[PDB]
Amino acid sequence: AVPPSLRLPVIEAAFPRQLHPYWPKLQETTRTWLLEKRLMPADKVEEYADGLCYTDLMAGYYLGAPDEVLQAIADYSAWNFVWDDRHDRDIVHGRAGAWRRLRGLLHTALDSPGDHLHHEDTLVAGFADSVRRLYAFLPATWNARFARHFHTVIEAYDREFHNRTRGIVPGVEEYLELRRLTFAHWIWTDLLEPSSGCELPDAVRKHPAYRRAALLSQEFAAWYNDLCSLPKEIAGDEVHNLGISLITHHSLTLEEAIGEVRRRVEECITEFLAVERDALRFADELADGTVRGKELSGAVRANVGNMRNWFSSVYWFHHESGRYMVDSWDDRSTPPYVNN
Ligand SMILES: CC[N+](CC)(CC)Cc1ccccc1
Ligand SMILES: [Mg+2]
Ligand SMILES: [Mg+2]
Ligand SMILES: [Mg+2]
């Protein structure tokens, strides 16, 4: 039963949820992986990991992924959550030296993950391990694009650090720019490709319908998050939230900001439904009747299919995950699953 303030009837009806069959194993393996890489304390894993629904999130998004591809993606994704928490704790404690070191450690590991599998900072070693596996699925051109995209994500996270320490709550249009990167829009978009086991030629993946569909899928997810994480983020002195920068710069009140964010989240859905028809038409014309044609077609179709799936996974993840249940924390500014 979703709060009316967060309820989106169109998702509930027109976007039926999906679940990868490897999910049950995925849940236990990724949990073990957080345990053995020491990414979270053992007693925080035992009592919170599964309840975080990190693996559920991805198993409802990357449908059709080879099991090991999914595993790589879920370990990486769960690492990303821990990184968000560490980034957040570096800010709350003003660990700028620590943050900056980590930052540079990450840029380096990204280009050279083998060399960092056993780095003393467990957060890095954990990064290097998932990244190393992600690079084993596709040609080095895909790997280079991922690194080029994730290099931008680290820097976006750096800008966030400069904003929170100062106090700068970005402008709405500025936030819209920053959010496509802090949410890692283009990472999730790249990982569509190993999930369907094909590196899409630029001509294919930059087709305007593929591009807009991909964009729209990611705007929904990110803006839904801001909507749903807004209470926990307010409590933790976040400044990075569409809700937040609407209040601050447009003098909308709480209930006015939430409404404008909701309206923008709904337009994503209906814009997605329009371009989805186009994306699928394209897939259907790729199939020129050659073996390569069938391959591109099937891969684009699957990717658009998973772009659609993201809507439902993200939606339900925000209501099933302990990550956002701030109303249950002894200290609302400090989530229990976080190392403080
Ligand atoms: C994992 C993606 N997420 C979780 C709500 C939306 C589906 C936001 C996110 C992006 C990047 C890092 C951490 C969280
Ligand atoms: Mg966060
Ligand atoms: Mg963040
Ligand atoms: Mg958030």
Query: Strands (DSSP E) along 36-130, which ranges?
Result: none
From residue 148, how far is each of 107, 186, 200 by CA, in Å?
10, 10, 16
Residue 260, C-beta contacts closer than 8 angstroms, at least 6 positions apart? 246, 252
- For residues 303, 305, 311, 315, the Cα torsion angle rounded to the nearest 10 degrees is -110
Note the residue count of the chain. Answer: 340
User: How is residue 102 written in tokens?
Assistant: 């980590």
For residues 276 and 297, is the Cβ–Cβ distance under 8 A? no
Distance CA 207, CA 90 (A): 40
CA of 147 to the centre of ligand 3 (A): 19
Among all ligands shown, which has an atom nearest to the Cα of 187?
A: 1
| DSSP assignment letter at 200 | P
Number of continuous H segments (helices) and E segments (strands) in the chain = 16, 0
Interaxial angle between packed helices 67-92 and 23-36, expressed in degrees from 0 to 180 and rounded to the nearest 10 = 40
Please, what sign has the CA dihedral across residues 101, 107, 110, 111?
Answer: negative
Q: For residues 100-122, b (16+ Cβ closer than 10 Å) or e, as one string?
A: eebbebbeebbeebeebeebebe
For residues 257 and 246, is the Cβ–Cβ distance under 8 A? yes
DSSP element (H, E) containing 29: helix 23-36
State the amino acid at position 25 in one-letter form.
K
Query: Strands (DSSP E) along 193-331, which ranges?
Result: none
State the amino acid at position 254 in one-letter form.
L
Distance CA 170, CA 319 (A): 27
Among all ligands shown, which has an atom nearest to the Cα of 228?
A: 4
Phi, psi at 331, each rounded to 5°: -125, 110
Query: Which residue do the tokens 């964009």 mark?
Result: 215
Distance CA 213, CA 188 (A): 13
Please, what sign has the CA dihedral across residues 158, 160, 163, 164?
Answer: negative
CA of 225 to the centre of ligand 4 (A): 5
Distance CA 61, CA 192 (A): 9
For residues 262 and 224, is the Cβ–Cβ distance under 8 A? no
State the amino acid at position 42 in one-letter form.
A
* Ligand 1 atom 1, closest CA: 77
Residue 181 near ligand 1, beta carbon < 6 Å:
no
Q: What angle do CA 42, 44, 47 make, to 5 degrees?
A: 110
CA of 212 to the centre of ligand 2 (A): 25
Residue 84 near ligand 1, beta carbon < 6 Å:
yes
For residues 333 and 235, is the Cβ–Cβ distance under 8 A? yes
State the amino acid at position 202 in one-letter form.
D
From residue 266, how far is each of 6, 59, 223, 227, 297 by CA, in Å?
11, 24, 10, 12, 29
User: How is residue 178 written in tokens?
Assistant: 């920053």
User: How is residue 183 written in tokens?
Assistant: 């949410």
For residue 54, the ligand 1 atom closest to its alpha carbon is 1
| DSSP assignment letter at 38 | T
Helical spans, DSSP H, in 93-139:
96-111, 122-134
Ligand-binding annotation for 340, yes or no, is: no
User: How is residue 308 written in tokens?
Assistant: 């659609």
Residue 221 near ligand 1, beta carbon < 6 Å:
yes
What is the SS3 assignment for 253? coil
| DSSP assignment letter at 114 | G
For residues 239 and 194, is the Cβ–Cβ distance under 8 A? no
DSSP element (H, E) containing 234: helix 208-235
DSSP element (H, E) containing 194: helix 192-195
Ligand-binding annotation for 143, yes or no, is: no
For the structural domain made of 1-340, what CATH number should be given?
A: 1.10.600.10
Residue 81, C-beta contacts closer than 8 angstroms, at least 6 positions apart? 52, 54, 323
Distance CA 69, CA 164 (A): 35
Q: How far is CA 31 from the centre of its chain?
A: 18
- The residue to mutate among 130, 183, 186, 338, having the most atoms of ligand 1 within 8 angstroms of its beta carbon, is 183
* Domain boundaries, given as residue ranges, for the chain: 1-340
C-beta neighbour count of 130 within 10 angstroms: 23
User: How is residue 220 written in tokens?
Assistant: 């929904």
Distance CA 120, CA 36 (A): 14
Instruction: With CA atoms as reference, report the closest residue to 65 among 312, 228, 299, 253.
Output: 299
